[PDB]
Amino acid sequence: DKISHKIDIPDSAWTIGIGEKFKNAGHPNVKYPMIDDSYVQGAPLGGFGAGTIGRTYNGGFSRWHLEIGKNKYTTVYANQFSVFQKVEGNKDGVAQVLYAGEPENGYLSSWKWDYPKESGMYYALYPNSWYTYTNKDLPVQLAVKQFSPIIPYNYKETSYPVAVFKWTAYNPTNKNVDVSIMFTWQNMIGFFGKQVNVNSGNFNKIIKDKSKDSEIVAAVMGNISNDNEEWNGEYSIGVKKVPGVDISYKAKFVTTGDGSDLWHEFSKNGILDNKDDETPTKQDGIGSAIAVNFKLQPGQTIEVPFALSWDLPIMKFGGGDKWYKMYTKYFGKNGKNSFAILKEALNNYQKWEKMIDDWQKPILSNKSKPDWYKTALFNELYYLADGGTAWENGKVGEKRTNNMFGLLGCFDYNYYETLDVRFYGSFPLVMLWPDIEKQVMRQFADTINVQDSSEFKVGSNGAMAVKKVQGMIPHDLGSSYALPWIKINAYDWQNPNIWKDLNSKYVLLVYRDYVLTGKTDKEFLKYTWKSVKTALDKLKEMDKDNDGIPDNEGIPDQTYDTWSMKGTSAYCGSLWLAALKAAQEIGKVLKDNEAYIKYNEWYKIAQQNFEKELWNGEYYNFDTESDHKDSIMADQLAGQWYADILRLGDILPKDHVQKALKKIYEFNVMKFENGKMGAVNGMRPDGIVDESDIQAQEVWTGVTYALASFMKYRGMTEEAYNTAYGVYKMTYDKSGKGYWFRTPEAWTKDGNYRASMYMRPLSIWSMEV
Numbered sequence: 120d121k122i123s124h125k126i127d128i129p130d131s132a133w134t135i136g137i138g139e140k141f142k143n144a145g146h147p148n149v150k151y152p153m154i155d156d157s158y159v160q161g162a163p164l165g166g167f168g169a170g171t172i173g174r175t176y177n178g179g180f181s182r183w184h185l186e187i188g189k190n191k192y193t194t195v196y197a198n199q200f201s202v203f204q205k206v207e208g209n210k211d212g213v214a215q216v217l218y219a220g221e222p223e224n225g226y227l228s229s230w231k232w233d234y235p236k237e238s239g240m241y242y243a244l245y246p247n248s249w250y251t252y253t254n255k256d257l258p259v260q261l262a263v264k265q266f267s268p269i270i271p272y273n274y275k276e277t278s279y280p281v282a283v284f285k286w287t288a289y290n291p292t293n294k295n296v297d298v299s300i301m302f303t304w305q306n307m308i309g310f311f312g313k314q315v316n317v318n319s320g321n322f323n324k325i326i327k328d329k330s331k332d333s334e335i336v337a338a339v340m341g342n343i344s345n346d347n348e349e350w351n352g353e354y355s356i357g358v359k360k361v362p363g364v365d366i367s368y369k370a371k372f373v374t375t376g377d378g379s380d381l382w383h384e385f386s387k388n389g390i391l392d393n394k395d396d397e398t399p400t401k402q403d404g405i406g407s408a409i410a411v412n413f414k415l416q417p418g419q420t421i422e423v424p425f426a427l428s429w430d431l432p433i434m435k436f437g438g439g440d441k442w443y444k445m446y447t448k449y450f451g452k453n454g455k456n457s458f459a460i461l462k463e464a465l466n467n468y469q470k471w472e473k474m475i476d477d478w479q480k481p482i483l484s485n486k487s488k489p490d491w492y493k494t495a496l497f498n499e500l501y502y503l504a505d506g507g508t509a510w511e512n513g514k515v516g517e518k519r520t521n522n523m524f525g526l527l528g529c530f531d532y533n534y535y536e537t538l539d540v541r542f543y544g545s546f547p548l549v550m551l552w553p554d555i556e557k558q559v560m561r562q563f564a565d566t567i568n569v570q571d572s573s574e575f576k577v578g579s580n581g582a583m584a585v586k587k588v589q590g591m592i593p594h595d596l597g598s599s600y601a602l603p604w605i606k607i608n609a610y611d612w613q614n615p616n617i618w619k620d621l622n623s624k625y626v627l628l629v630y631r632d633y634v635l636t637g638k639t640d641k642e643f644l645k646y647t648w649k650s651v652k653t654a655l656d657k658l659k660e661m662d663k664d665n666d667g668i669p670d671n672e673g674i675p676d677q678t679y680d681t682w683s684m685k686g687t688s689a690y691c692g693s694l695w696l697a698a699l700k701a702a703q704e705i706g707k708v709l710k711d712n713e714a715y716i717k718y719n720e721w722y723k724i725a726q727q728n729f730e731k732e733l734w735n736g737e738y739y740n741f742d743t744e745s746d747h748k749d750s751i752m753a754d755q756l757a758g759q760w761y762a763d764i765l766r767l768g769d770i771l772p773k774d775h776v777q778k779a780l781k782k783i784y785e786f787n788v789m790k791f792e793n794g795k796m797g798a799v800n801g802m803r804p805d806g807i808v809d810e811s812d813i814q815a816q817e818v819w820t821g822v823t824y825a826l827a828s829f830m831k832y833r834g835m836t837e838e839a840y841n842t843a844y845g846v847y848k849m850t851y852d853k854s855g856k857g858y859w860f861r862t863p864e865a866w867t868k869d870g871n872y873r874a875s876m877y878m879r880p881l882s883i884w885s886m887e888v
């Protein structure tokens with residue numbers, strides 16, 4: 120490996136061998152069907168709301184999130200980079216697809232598949248990833264850096280449906296070598312969204328943009344139809360000329376054939392026919408190829424940028440609504456703009472690399488923090504783009520000031536902005552994209568007094584319940600299978616209108632978003648103030664025994680939605696105390712004296728009673744009335760955690776908080792698989808895991824990272840990082856369960872999982888406050 124020194128991969132990048140087999144991988148631990156796409160994954164390409172494309176460590180374009188809200192795992196075999204090399208003085212060269220695998224059937228059988236093991240590495244530090252190719256039959260060593268311009272405090276480039284591939288080639292040998300690099304792409308119009316005739320009318324054109332000291336050659340893969348539909352638009356691939364390289368191309372090869380129409384050209388001398396051909400296809404799949412060829416002398420290095428764009432302007436949800444994607448603000452809505460997007464990327468990628476370095480540097484250059492923590496911190500952010508992210512620039516047919524946004528809680532439970540989850544998972548948005556975060560919270564504010572009296576069947580018990588009650592915060596803002604932003608509370612496993620955490624979490628989210636953006640945005644507090652008061656006042660009515668605290672009803676009426684709470688719970692009770700304190704503070708800021716006084720009175724009664732009812736000498740009891748009321752809950756002081764972040768002070772005595780955190784570390788972490796797997800949710804005082812429900816026996820990745828944050832602010836530095844380390848280990852390490860780029864909600868002691876690709880572990884960013 121002589122290529123690594125010619126590029127700059129950070130030491131904290133997650134790494135794996137190209138073609139590496141992983142033997143320890145986990146699988147779903149539930150009885151019902153659940154997504155399991157294997158450990159063959161990688162860092163996604165594509166901006167927020169653009170649709171994303173997962174290119175795996177093996178080289179394949181395999182995890183398709185282009186249909187917004189859907190996850191489709193299938194390798195499109197025509198989508199590859201290939202290499203040709205010929206040593207000066209040999210008769211023949213060699214050609215190889217840079218993919219550690221081969222197709223399942225006979226399409227593209229002529230290509231050279233099965234890139235060999237032990238011949239290259241994959242590296243990821245989101246939003247960048249890299250592949251190196253150090254192969255004994257390839258005398259020139261190659262590497263590529265691939266990325267999309269995901270940039271904090273930037274709402275423009277961050278939205279683009281574009282990827283850059285910056286290639287570096289180096290000749291360490293003592294002979295001249297001819298090298299070609301070829302990008303192939305299938306015209307994927309009709310891959311989704313088209314009910315019949317899936318390739319019909321697809322056609323490919325070549326654009327040569329020559330303008331002084333710039334040459335771009337690109338393929339635009341579109342359809343003859345000008346229909347404005349979810350399925351229609353363009354894909355583009357291309358390359359920018361640099362000194363010392365020639366460009367060649369082929370507009371049309373057949374993907375549903377043996378591939379030899381292209382491969383016979385590339386395998387001879389790495390130079391394509393330059394055959395333009397705009398003939399549309401009927402039933403056959405088609406694609407395009409863009410290639411560079413160059414001669415490398417001994418010791419010579421060259422850099423060449425390629426790019427990929429996709430202009431699919433319309434997203435459609437299962438309920439029938441069609442919206443424009445955010446990026447259409449910058450490029451247009453007509454679906455004929457893939458080349459403009461590609462050209463912007465090819466002409467500006469160096470600036471974008473620097474912008475990315477500028478935001479990663481403060482963390483990467485802090486040598487008090489271990490590399491493993493940086494690996495997790497950056498790579499967990501994959502989910503902001505990969506979580507079915509929806510970001511609208513108008514409904515099709517209909518202009519507003521704001522652009523509505525939604526991130527899925529996960530794919531198995533397909534709900535937007537699941538609020539009990541975003542309490543943990545929204546930290547990256549408030550810290551790095553606060554205008555999106557405040558938009559999402561205004562979306563929730565607007566729903567507070569919505570009433571929907573129609574009834575749905577509650578999944579857990581079969582009872583009928585009202586869809587949406589006035590004054591109760593919704594569980595979510597809809598499903599991608601239905602109508603995001605329009606029909607809320609798609610979730611139906613329990614009735615969220617009787618949940619005891621949603622209304623408090625909502626208030627705490629609101630005050631967080633003011634505090635973490637500088638305590639300046641009074642207009643945001645004003646917009647949300649009525650909803651905050653309404654939310655707290657409605658939750659107070661759920662206090663059954665006049666102790667000043669809402670009563671859990673002996674059912675799972677909160678985020679742990681199979682784990683029953685009854686009476687005063689540590690979890691919902693602490694959240695209530697914190698929410699009251701936040702509302703007092705907002706009352707002072709806005710000069711609402713009667714609110715300050717009311718919430719101050721409620722707070723002091725509830726605080727007293729919380730302490731009397733739950734404090735046992737060592738920790739706070741799980742609740743006042745359940746069968747395992749004395750279980751040690753990992754999340755027992757969630758309200759005090761948020762109070763620390765919000766700078767609201769002590770809601771409970773410092774001494775008791777410290778004792779409770781130490782107990783949690785001693786029990787829920789250290790007595791669960793030797794503290795190498797996170798914090799198990801429920802432990803009995805005898806040190807055996809609580810067996811009252813599956814969720815008690817699960818480690819929750821986002822709860823664990825948030826508990827790490829809490830420990831860190833309380834000066835328990837070693838405990839904090841050791842607690843977090845088990846999550847990192849299980850997710851990324853060779854000794855873990857293979858969950859890189861699909862961090863789940865939960866695992867049990869055997870390491871098997873529930874709900875891969877989950878929002879909650881984005882809470883690792885609470886460790887950076």
Ligand SMILES: OC[C@H]1O[C@@H](O[C@H]2[C@H](O)[C@@H](O)[C@H](O[C@H]3[C@H](O)[C@@H](O)[C@H](O)O[C@@H]3CO)O[C@@H]2CO)[C@H](O)[C@@H](O)[C@@H]1O
Binds near residue numbers: 532611
């Ligand atoms: O909907 C989201 C919630 O899902 C919960 O899992 C439940 C499944 O949604 C549900 O389909 C499954 O149904 C069981 C059913 O209860 C049982 O009687 C029958 O015999 O088998 C069905 C599955 O084959 O129940 C599970 C609960 O066990 C998650 O637990 C929850 O966290 C999530 O929000």
Ligand SMILES: [Ca+2]
Binds near residue numbers: 687
């Ligand atoms: Ca009560």
